[PDB]
Amino acid sequence: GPVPSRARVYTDVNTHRPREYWDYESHVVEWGNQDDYQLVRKLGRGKYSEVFEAINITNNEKVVVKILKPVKKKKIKREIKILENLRGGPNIITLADIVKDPVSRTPALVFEHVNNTDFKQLYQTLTDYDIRFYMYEILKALDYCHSMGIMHRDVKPHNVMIDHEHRKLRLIDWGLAEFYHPGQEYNVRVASRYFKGPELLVDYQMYDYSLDMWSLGCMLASMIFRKEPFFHGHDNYDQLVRIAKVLGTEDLYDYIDKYNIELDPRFNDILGRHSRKRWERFVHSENQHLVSPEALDFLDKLLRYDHQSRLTAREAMEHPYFYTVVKD
Numbered sequence: 141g142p143v144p145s146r147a148r149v150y151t152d153v154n155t156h157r158p159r160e161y162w163d164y165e166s167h168v169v170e171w172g173n174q175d176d177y178q179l180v181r182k183l184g185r186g187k188y189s190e191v192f193e194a195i196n197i198t199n200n201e202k203v204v205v206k207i208l209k210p211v212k213k214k215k216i217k218r219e220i221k222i223l224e225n226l227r228g229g230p231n232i233i234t235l236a237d238i239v240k241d242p243v244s245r246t247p248a249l250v251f252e253h254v255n256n257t258d259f260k261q262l263y264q265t266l267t268d269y270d271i272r273f274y275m276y277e278i279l280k281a282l283d284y285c286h287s288m289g290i291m292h293r294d295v296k297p298h299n300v301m302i303d304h305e306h307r308k309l310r311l312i313d314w315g316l317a318e319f320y321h322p323g324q325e326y327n328v329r330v331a332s333r334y335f336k337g338p339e340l341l342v343d344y345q346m347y348d349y350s351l352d353m354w355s356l357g358c359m360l361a362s363m364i365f366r367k368e369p370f371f372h373g374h375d376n377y378d379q380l381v382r383i384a385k386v387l388g389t390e391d392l393y394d395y396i397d398k399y400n401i402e403l404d405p406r407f408n409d410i411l412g413r414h415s416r417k418r419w420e421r422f423v424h425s426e427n428q429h430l431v432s433p434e435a436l437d438f439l440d441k442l443l444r445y446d447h448q449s450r451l452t453a454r455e456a457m458e459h460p461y462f463y464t465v466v467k468d
């Protein structure tokens with residue numbers, strides 16, 4: 141059977157927290173007043189929610205309202221508990237209130253309003269300095285939630301809100317997030333295809349916070365190389381082949397051999413043999429202003445097959461890539 145795995149950091153955060161901290165099924169929601177919020181316009185719809193801009197008529201301030209779609213009360217209470225546990229943490233979206241929507245018959249989560257700059261306008265404009273600055277801001281959120289025993293499991297551009305005017309960033313949509321318990325097997329059907337870590341794509345269930353660091357590396361690669369998404373697979377099998385054409389097949393076999401994983405035999409006709417590539421091959425005249433030796437070394441240390449070998453969030457914040465970023 142598969143070789144077990146543990147996070148190399150924050151391994152026992154939840155074992156030493158009180159049970160109420162991670163036992164989200166027993167959480168008792170404290171409901172606010174549903175008429176406090178006047179919906180203004182629909183911002184978006186996803187598979188699990190619809191999001192609206194609203195006015196909190198009690199303090200005359202803008203908020204956003206996330207009306208959850210019908211899903212098992214455990215995933216709803218899981219998200220609520222995680223948001224309450226993380227509230228006040230650096231660059232974590234702030235849950236302001238929870239109300240019962242009378243039409244959907246589900247909870248509506250009320251969040252702080254972030255004046256989000258257009259995500260397409262954003263990445264086409266980000267300077268080298270901006271990319272380093274916002275990556276550091278994302279790392280603050282990830283180190284915080286990891287230090288709190290939680291993995292996000294859905295890091296991707298759509299879940300990073302940036303108000304570029306005020307240089308303000310928030311990590312949102314904690315609906316896939318989970319508590320990390322050593323030895324626990326987790327669902328591999330998490331994250332968007334282009335950001336799925338190798339552990340998900342080879343069906344290795346005993347993963348940890350380091351999943352988020354692969355996803356972060358995929359975002360970084362897309363930003364500094366101006367290729368969206370970077371690993372552009374047609375399905376979850378082709379996604380791993382795309383990764384293997386860059387990281388190479390010998391290190392993929394080393395990875396699965398370390399954990400006693402076998403590839404789906406359907407890979408026999410599609411995977412091939414591939415050398416590991418050097419990151420410089422992706423540099424060209426239209427992205428070179430975003431690339432530096434430090435950027436490539438940082439990216440290289442995030443994008444490892446072996447989840448145990450990736451930089452942790454705190455280690456990433458120590459990387460020379462961020463030396464140029466002005467610290468508060």
Ligand SMILES: COc1cc(/C=C(\C#N)C(=O)Nc2nnc(Br)s2)ccc1O
Pocket residue numbers: 183184186189191204206233251253254255256301312313314315
């Ligand atoms: C989907 O899950 C979440 C979403 C949000 C927030 C937004 C969304 N979508 C949002 O504020 N979008 C905006 N677009 N323009 C402006 Br101006 S604000 C907050 C917490 C969540 O868990």
